[PDB]
């Protein structure tokens, strides 16, 4: 019936106050009640606020609604921001059919940057009787969350047969993972393989040998 | 205390259908009424089906076009969603949700459906292995997600990382890891224990050093 835009990011410090936006295009703001709902990452959604204003029991007073009537808006004011509440909060209203905003990506800054932990596993000797071999890298305890990942093949670049994920977050930090796809003939062959992680302007490297 | 419980979806065909099913309890069912809603990475919350308290009144999203139909079962205090007509835009996951009048007071924990032509494939585990030692388990070319990894049936809980997996050539793989002292692996064997549920597969393997 109408659009509800939110902006898709907000980044902001501990302790700080943040006010997330939700803009009705067409009809008035006021004339349907507007809910909020925060989505931890790989989680259902939670009320955080229902019918403009108020409070579920159990969540925090830090949360509260407002309507902005001149800007068409509803507002989720954030106090005292905590790491905790680094989540996606989708706003909701309705006229003639349910409408959702498209979610505010809230991320609390301050955390220490960290190196990756990396972890390399050869090829099972279980998958090399199918003649396959997989190496595989893990990558781990790093923020923030950008890396670019590479293989090496007795010292060489070796680029056929990547596959790396995306970071993902886990608790505090970021993973990531990938894997370099061989024959198994490839992989008793060579005297060794590394896989090299640069971040924030630092390589991390481990090696496989056969 | 409320409990809303999807089950019914997976992998299904463009053009077949699947029918959802939410089962609750923590409250009279017969008193609110019930809703759907999906979530892309990409395009967020969509609002999917509303059904009455008393059942005799059903809404639709854009989206569905005729193709769904939404219901409930006062006696067995469940709702459903069939999906008729599937695309591959249909690929989501769904969650079904409680209402209070005018807001979703409750959400269930979300189930995925998949709309391809590609069939179920298991994934094949391999036991990966080399103070603290860090093992492994390689769950490698299944289709579709998801699947789930424990170790030593639970009894293992920290140290445990399980990695977002890559798709490569239409399958999916990934690693779980965790990280014991050396005195566990000397003193037990540990255990990685894989589950696909679209192949029915569950796999435990002993990692060997």
């Known amino acids: 019936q109408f659009v509800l835009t939110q902006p898709n990011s907000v980044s902001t410090n501990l302790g700080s106050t943040v006010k997330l936006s939700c803009k009705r295009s067409?009809?008035?703001?006021?004339?349907?009640?507007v809910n909020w709902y925060q989505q931890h990452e790989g989680r259902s959604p939670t009320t955080m606020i229902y019918?403009?204003?108020?409070?579920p029991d159990g969540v925090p007073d830090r949360f509260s609604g407002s309507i902005d009537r001149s800007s068409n808006s509803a507002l989720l004011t954030i106090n005292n921001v905590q790491t905790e509440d680094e989540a996606d909060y989708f706003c909701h209203s309705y006229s003639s059919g349910i409408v959702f905003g498209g979610g505010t990506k809230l991320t609390v800054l301050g955390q220490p940057k960290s190196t990756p932990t990396l972890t390399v596993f050869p090829p099972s000797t279980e998958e090399l009787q199918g003649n396959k071999a997989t190496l595989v890298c893990l990558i781990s305890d790093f923020y923030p969350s950008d890396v670019e990942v590479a293989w090496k093949a007795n010292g060489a670049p070796i680029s056929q047969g990547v596959d790396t994920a995306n970071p993902t977050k886990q608790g505090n930090k970021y993973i990531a993972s990938s894997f370099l796809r061989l024959t198994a003939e490839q992989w008793r062959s060579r005297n060794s393989f590394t896989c090299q992680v640069t971040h924030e302007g630092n390589t991390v490297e481990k090696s496989l040998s056969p | 205390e409320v409990q809303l419980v999807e089950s019914g979806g997976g992998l299904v065909q463009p053009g077949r259908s699947l029918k959802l099913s939410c089962a609750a309890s923590?409250?009279?069912?017969?008193?609110?009424?019930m809703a759907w809603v999906r979530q892309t990475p990409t395009k967020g919350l969509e609002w999917i089906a509303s059904?009455?308290?008393?059942?005799?009144?059903?809404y639709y999203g854009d989206s569905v076009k005729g193709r769904f139909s939404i219901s409930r079962d006062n006696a067995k205090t469940t709702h459903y969603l069939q999906m008729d007509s599937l695309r591959s835009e249909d690929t989501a996951t769904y969650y079904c949700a409680k209402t209070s009048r005018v807001y979703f007071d409750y959400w269930g924990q979300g189930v995925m459906v998949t709309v391809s032509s590609a069939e179920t494939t298991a994934p094949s585990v391999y036991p990966l292995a080399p103070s603290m030692v860090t093992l492994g388990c390689l769950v490698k070319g299944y289709f579709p997600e998801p699947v789930t990894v424990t170790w030593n049936s639970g009894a293992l809980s920290s140290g445990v990382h399980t990695f977002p997996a890559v798709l490569q050539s239409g399958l999916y793989t990934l690693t779980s890891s965790v990280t014991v002292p050396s005195s566990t692996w000397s003193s037990q064997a540990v255990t990685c224990n894989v589950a696909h549920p679209a192949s029915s597969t569950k796999v435990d393997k002993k990692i060997v050093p």
């Open positions: 019918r403009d204003d108020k409070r």
């Open positions: 067409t009809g008035n703001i006021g004339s349907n009640y």
């Open positions: 923590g409250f009279t069912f017969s008193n609110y009424g």
């Open positions: 059904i009455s308290a008393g059942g005799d009144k059903t």
